[PDB]
Amino acid sequence: NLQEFLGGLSPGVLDRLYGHPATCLAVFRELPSLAKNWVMRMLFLEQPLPQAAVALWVKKEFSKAQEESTGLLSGLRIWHTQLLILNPIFRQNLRIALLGGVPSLDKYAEERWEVVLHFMVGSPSAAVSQDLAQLLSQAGLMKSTEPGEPPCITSAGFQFLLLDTPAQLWYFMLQYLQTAQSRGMDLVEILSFLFQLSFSDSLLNFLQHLREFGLVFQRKRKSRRYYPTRLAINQPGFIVVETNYRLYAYTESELQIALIALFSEMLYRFPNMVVAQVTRESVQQAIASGITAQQIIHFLRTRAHPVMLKQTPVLPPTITDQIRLWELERDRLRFTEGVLYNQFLSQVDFELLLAHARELGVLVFENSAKRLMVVTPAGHSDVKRFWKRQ
Amino acid sequence: LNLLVIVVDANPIWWGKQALKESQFTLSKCIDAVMVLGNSHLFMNRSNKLAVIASHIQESRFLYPGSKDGKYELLTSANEVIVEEIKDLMTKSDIKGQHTETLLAGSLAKALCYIHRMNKEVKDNQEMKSRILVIKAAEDSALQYMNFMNVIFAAQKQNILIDACVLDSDSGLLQQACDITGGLYLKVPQMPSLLQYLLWVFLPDQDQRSQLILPPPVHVDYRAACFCHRNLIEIGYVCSVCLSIFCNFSPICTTCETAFKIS
Amino acid sequence: AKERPIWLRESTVQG
Amino acid sequence: TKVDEYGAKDYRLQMPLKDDHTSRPLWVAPDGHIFLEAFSPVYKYAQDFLVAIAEPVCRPTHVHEYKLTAYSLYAAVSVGLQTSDITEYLRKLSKTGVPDGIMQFIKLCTVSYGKVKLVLKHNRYFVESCHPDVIQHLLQDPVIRECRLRQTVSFEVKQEMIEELQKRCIHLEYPLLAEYDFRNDSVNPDINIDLKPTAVLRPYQEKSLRKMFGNGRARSGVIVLPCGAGKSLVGVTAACTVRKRCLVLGNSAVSVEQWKAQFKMWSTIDDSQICRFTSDAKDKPIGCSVAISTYSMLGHTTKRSWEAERVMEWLKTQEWGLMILDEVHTIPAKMFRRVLTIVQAHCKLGLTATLVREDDKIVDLNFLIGPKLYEANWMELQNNGYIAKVQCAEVWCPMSPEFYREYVAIKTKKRILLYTMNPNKFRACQFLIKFHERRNDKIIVFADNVFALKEYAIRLNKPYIYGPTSQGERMQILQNFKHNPKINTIFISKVGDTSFDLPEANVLIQISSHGGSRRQEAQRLGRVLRAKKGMVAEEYNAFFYSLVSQDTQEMAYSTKRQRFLVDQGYSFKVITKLAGMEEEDLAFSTKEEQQQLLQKVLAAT
Ligand SMILES: [Zn+2]
């Protein structure tokens, strides 16, 4: 989440990131419940106050909210104890932020994201962009290993594909920022633009990438002014599930049919409908590719036709249980690398080695009755060194 | 979400008395503080919405239905609209010596129906917790008791909190009003430091008000008096028609003219 | 009374 | 014909889409498959029309699946639906048009009907035809000449070769008409049989009877109805309506007894007018007309006792207005099918509840008797309450380690006796039976292996029944199960699924299965479908458990066996583990007991 992203930052980058225009407001909106109230209170104070007052300024009931808010805002470093006055820079910027100082766009965003997903999947016809391809490859969801041949899709790629559009896009942009730092693009400058959206060379390239993703559209031959789409700021279902593992999806966009075929066997394709079967072959194929039953169940639930919404649960228990059992059977045999021991002359030495392995985290499994254990190869060197040291 | 409504009692007689006195506090600063409070309320969340009403002896008018200084566009629009409308209202006003007491019941009625309209229009998916941050600035009128009580009971039934913020005077009617609906009652004695009071006592919404320490409520004197005297009375002799608190047993209450039968 | 068994009322699969 | 990048066939360039597709709830695939919506407001009308012109293959709650064939279209024409009368409404209902392939198929199937009619008179089968060109171009192959015994043109045909000629015509594209004009028939006098007002006909029964009697002439076909739905009542009503000599064919002594009881109960026909042409007992079969007999006797191939020979000659000589055949799924058998040609009947109605089998001989029924007239909707009956709602479940029992070791180690087929008898399933069935016994639910345990059935029954001291069990003891055990409160469970063998009149049971556990037999699965499931006096559909009072052993061939057999039930719509819920099993004390709680059971299994040989 954005809270995680901002928490994973240093004070030096934090205070700089607290730009005047928007950041002080975007980070404010993050404040879940109560820290908003304290920020407004001590927005006008130039004198720090004791911590005991903040501690006792919440009733005995629901105190956990007080501690969690205080910890979150301490991590954000909005104030300093100074002994709890807010940062002067943040105070000034917030005062300046507080009385101081479309139908075609959404369709465009939808179409651009749909073509991006088409390229992500093995679609023969898709938008071509070397920068987009390499960006997705380095995002960790795609690997090519051969420039001549089109890149394939890694295990994480299918999991990313089956995610919902909001979370999918949010994770994609998170990876974009993480790779932006690696490629050398300043993180603060690009990050501030995202906050400003919800209200230089690097800026131009970043806006080009955002437009390629479909969040923004200049509409004027790449002019300075931009009109963000709905997705920039941050629908009914169509699948009907039977009790015989049969899916009838009212899909016209090829993306939905491809997503369903990823874990189901297609039987018929009507102009406004498609029939597929969820069989062991397809489900285990998806599981081997890397998906887990949770993603499939969530995908079918979110794309649930209104007809089956009346019944509770929406997805039939037999279908859900069958999918879960199919995924479990694949991982019945759990493989874990390790090194076995044999010929323990005395159990005292074995117990001492067990205690050492437990302390170091090396041990994976132990058997007192048989006087043996298993250690991962990483800890094999450590235990071997201990044995040599005697 | 939350729909806040600021009912400012901008009585020209009293505020101009302050202006003549040349006191530190002024109606301009009061309007600025109210503006800051509304801006902070909307600052709290996007879904939150606000409105403003100004009271005058004649009538009450709504003060509220790019980034030149690098400002948020919506709050900039709020600032401009409120400033222009308040200046217009204060600049233009007829003179009527007979009527000088500030009017508040009508303003609160306008508020209540406005909240009802917004509650009807808003989607049923999101629940709205409306509030009325009344800011009195002058003594109330005796003749307004009945209508003010009607609107207070309507607010109680409709579940709106009347947070009174009287200053320079303690209106027993207004404290009684907010007590009925459970709204907070704060009497700021330091007018220059009024805005700090808003950002603590009033600003937090009903959702978080319970889980927060706020000044204790003031004792309310639910007095009763006979229609003869207007003096406190502990025993009242009401009839079945007037429902009027009277002085002492009488053959017939004047306001009724009923043919009471002795016994 | 005459309520259905637990293992039929809710899925017994570990998920 | 066109295949997309995926498995599904492509029809983007095949047929168009109607603009008012949302209004139209019907789909039409080129292969003949039709997908109807159960949520559309016109669902009832669409269901009636699609049932009239097509046979269901899958009817889940939301989207029903039908497929039409030549036999279904012939049945539609028999009930009197013309090619236009069906195709115009099909196009109107269809939300994506009608492919030219289906159009031409419907036209050809409808036109190729009624040209050739088969009528039996004076013990002679004449192939009548108003059009003579049909016969002129039908006498090309020599089989017709060799078969034939050595306008409105008709010729006599040999009795024995009727089946061969009929199956030949089916692929010759000239189906024969078996309609019986019982209304206009003076050769055989009508029998004094009437339907008493006491009998009550349910709406689905009336609909099936109407589809059979689409016109004044009765149609010969197969009506599939659940055993608890009153198929016996439907057959009795059909015979009463026919008002001519009726020969009912059961499959066993219990079947013939039940048929006689149903006849007496629901028909005013006198007792003396009904006979039981049965070896165990007879009631002067030649004396009266309405007869009940058995396939085994009528098709008996070996020596015939003199009295039975006289009766058989009388039956062959006489002509029957109606030939009712219960449990038609066994008809395509050699001896059983020989009975069709052995006996003469105008219309041979067929009744059953599990019209499914592995060998592709079910298709032969379409010509052996006729097209499948009606097939009751099990889900709709459940909703209407005519049939008790069933909470179908499959209890997965993990196989014990040693048992799995021997099972996998041996490549022989002792596994049938091994995995059917494992400690985990034994404990599971014991715990389930205990839970239902304390719940006052009647239990009917099933097991194909008599050895395993006997072992389980002795270990649980319960009254197991099986083939060579004495009839008196069988009746005593059934009476005790029905009446004695102290006992509420009976362990029946395969004989149970064949034919019986057993009391309604609240649960049905199946520890073992004969194999991938949809017939057996449906037959055993039908036992608990008996609706209670005042139950409710949503209460799920009836339960069916099909215990299976994990990681064994039993899983494959169960999955292949539940196909018919899932097609009907029943959702089999999987139960990996049962709550309270650990706390409850059960047999085989120690390694030693499993060891002795394994040793006994190994010594079984
Ligand atoms: Zn009165």
Side-chain angles (χ1 to χ4, degrees), chain B residues 238-244 246 253-258:
Chain B
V238 308
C239 77
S240 192
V241 189
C242 296
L243 188 153
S244 298
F246 277 107
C253 47
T254 61
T255 60
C256 200
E257 316 175 355
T258 177

Side-chain angles (χ1 to χ4, degrees), chain A residues 39-295:
Chain A
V39 163
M40 271 82 78
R41 300 173 64 192
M42 64 192 67
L43 184 55
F44 290 77
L45 277 286
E46 294 291 339
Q47 199 271 329
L49 57 85
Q51 291 71 246
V54 167
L56 62 85
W57 272 342
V58 165
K59 285 195 184 296
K60 65 210 85 165
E61 198 69 30
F62 315 115
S63 296
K64 314 312 302 195
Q66 173 63 282
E67 292 83 4
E68 56 86 17
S69 71
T70 314
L72 174 58
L73 278 79
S74 83
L76 298 170
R77 297 168 146 287
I78 292 163
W79 62 78
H80 317 305
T81 182
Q82 203 181 8
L83 195 75
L84 295 160
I85 200 171
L86 312 187
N87 300 15
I89 183 60
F90 184 79
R91 166 183 275 91
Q92 193 197 355
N93 281 12
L94 175 51
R95 201 191 311 284
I96 296 303
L98 193 150
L99 179 39
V102 169
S104 170
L105 282 71
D106 55 65
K107 299 306 307 312
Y108 154 84
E110 200 177 9
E111 208 288 328
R112 184 64 60 85
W113 202 231
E114 273 198 52
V115 295
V116 166
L117 296 163
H118 287 116
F119 157 75
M120 178 60 203
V121 301
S123 187
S125 180
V128 301
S129 184
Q130 65 93 29
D131 56 358
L132 185 66
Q134 59 85 34
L135 175 61
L136 288 157
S137 176
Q138 74 193 346
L141 54 78
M142 267 176 81
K143 81 189 183 296
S144 86
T145 71
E146 40 182 359
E149 199 72 28
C152 57
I153 296 90
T154 66
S155 296
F158 294 105
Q159 305 191 17
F160 160 91
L161 275 161
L162 295 192
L163 296 196
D164 302 334
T165 316
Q168 190 176 220
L169 192 83
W170 154 245
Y171 160 82
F172 181 58
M173 290 173 69
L174 182 139
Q175 286 299 101
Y176 178 96
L177 297 169
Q178 268 188 12
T179 47
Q181 187 59 44
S182 296
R183 70 181 93 166
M185 289 291 106
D186 50 354
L187 190 145
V188 179
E189 184 60 28
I190 67 184
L191 180 59
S192 198
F193 187 94
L194 309 174
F195 295 160
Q196 190 269 326
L197 277 182
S198 180
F199 298 114
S200 68
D201 189 299
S202 177
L203 282 165
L204 289 156
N205 199 6
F206 169 83
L207 188 68
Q208 195 265 317
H209 280 177
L210 271 293
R211 182 255 296 166
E212 209 161 9
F213 305 155
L215 312 196
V216 295
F217 182 35
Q218 285 85 343
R219 197 164 267 181
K220 201 158 83 72
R221 301 282 81 74
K222 301 290 94 175
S223 66
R224 196 260 293 165
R225 173 60 184 165
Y226 50 84
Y227 288 107
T229 71
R230 264 291 303 286
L231 279 67
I233 296 90
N234 308 116
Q235 60 90 42
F238 51 83
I239 312 190
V240 172
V241 189
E242 303 298 347
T243 63
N244 57 3
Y245 316 110
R246 198 75 74 79
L247 314 171
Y248 302 79
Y250 305 79
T251 54
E252 295 85 350
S253 63
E254 208 274 333
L255 173 62
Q256 300 297 346
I257 297 89
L259 293 182
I260 285 162
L262 282 170
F263 67 99
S264 78
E265 295 194 350
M266 283 178 56
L267 302 190
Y268 308 90
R269 185 162 174 194
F270 305 127
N272 64 357
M273 199 262 277
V274 67
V275 187
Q277 200 188 4
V278 184
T279 61
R280 288 178 62 261
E281 310 173 7
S282 87
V283 161
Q284 273 208 333
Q285 194 188 8
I287 295 286
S289 77
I291 299 144
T292 175
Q294 177 42 244
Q295 288 105 25

